[PDB]
């Protein structure tokens, strides 16, 4: 995490690139201590692909036993051709709550559980 937070700010990236290389097997206390004298200036700043698509992407991936990349492409071509609406119905039975809650717990996996319900 601590490296991936400075991964957004490119000015901190030289030290993050080093700890990526050689920081493996380096002490946690040493990791913070290296990044102490390594990051330039401070004044901590801001922060660091949607649900209803990411259920289909991960549902097609498990059905055809393909990877994210392949699953992502599957949908994009199916949105263009032979009814993605049909294959949505083909996969309404394997939308278990263990499947659902695994992606976005919060409160969406209940508005998503019975979201793909109405697909018949």
């Amino acid at each position: 995490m601590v490296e991936n937070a400075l991964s957004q700010f490119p000015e901190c990236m030289p030290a993050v690139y080093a700890m990526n290389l050689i920081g493996s097997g380096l002490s946690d206390e040493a990791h913070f201590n290296y990044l102490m004298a390594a990051v330039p200036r401070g004044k901590r700043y801001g922060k660091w692909e949607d649900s209803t698509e990411v259920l289909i992407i991960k549902l097609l991936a498990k059905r055809y036993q393909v990877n994210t990349n392949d699953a992502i492409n599957y949908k994009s071509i199916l949105t263009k051709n032979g009814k993605l609406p049909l294959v949505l119905k083909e996969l309404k039975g394997l939308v278990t709550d263990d499947f659902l809650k695994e992606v976005t717990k919060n409160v969406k996996e209940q508005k998503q559980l019975k979201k793909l319900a109405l697909e018949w």
Partner: protein, 319 residues
Amino acid sequence: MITVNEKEHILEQKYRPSTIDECILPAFDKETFKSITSKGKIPHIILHSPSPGTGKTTVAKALCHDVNADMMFVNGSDCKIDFVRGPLTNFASAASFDGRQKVIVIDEFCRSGLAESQRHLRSFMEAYSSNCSIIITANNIDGIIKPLQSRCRVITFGQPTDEDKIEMMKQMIRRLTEICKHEGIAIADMKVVAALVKKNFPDFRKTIGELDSYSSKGVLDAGILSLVTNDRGAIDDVLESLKNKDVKQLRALAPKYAADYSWFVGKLAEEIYSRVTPQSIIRMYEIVGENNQYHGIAANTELHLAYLFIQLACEMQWK
């Protein structure tokens, strides 16, 4: 003159204080305890200090003994949920025919997964606090949920002011004297006890123990003084040879630590971080972390460790 538990043999607890006035605390805290005992009833008190052996469990027991309280001592680790609802409630709701204040000491309460039992204790303090009070002794204060510190009087140990530290160490130098008087230890040099108290200060349990380990001769001559002042080593020879750029000793110390490479590289980073300049802190962790990254890829691990020594000598600007 010192309370002894003549069934202890272990020094570090044979002479554990009984009352507040026997304890060695900062004057304000020591006064705040004597006043808490004077007022009759003990409040909810959290005694904490990250540095161990400062007086927590002693003061917790000393408050119960001064007040002459019906004390229920419990190991905070066995203070699970079925315990707070069980023997804790049975005691809190017992009849105090004795009139003495019921007080429950939860020793070493700060723990990882005792969260549900911890919040139960807070809600327990809205029901049975009418009857009993609770003394908590913890090291990490954060291990304690915020509601408890909000209610309890949090007295932080082991964080004394300069003037408070000076008087406390002087009191402790007199304690170890009265220990050596009562145990049979000859104090040939008084600077031993002074250096004993000073070397490992806030931990009063540890400094009494160190006196036991240095009492192996039965006398505290200046040789024992030379022991206590001898700052030990760990890897003091490598740090020394790195500051001196002594290529000969780096060449001969690399076969010394190539056996336990992974420990030594971790111990070396820990030691140089204090001894080296800040602009060198960058090159330090880069040289070491890279050398450890290729550890095992390097065919000769001993020469690879000498490589680390040569690399540091050339690149470290020393303090």
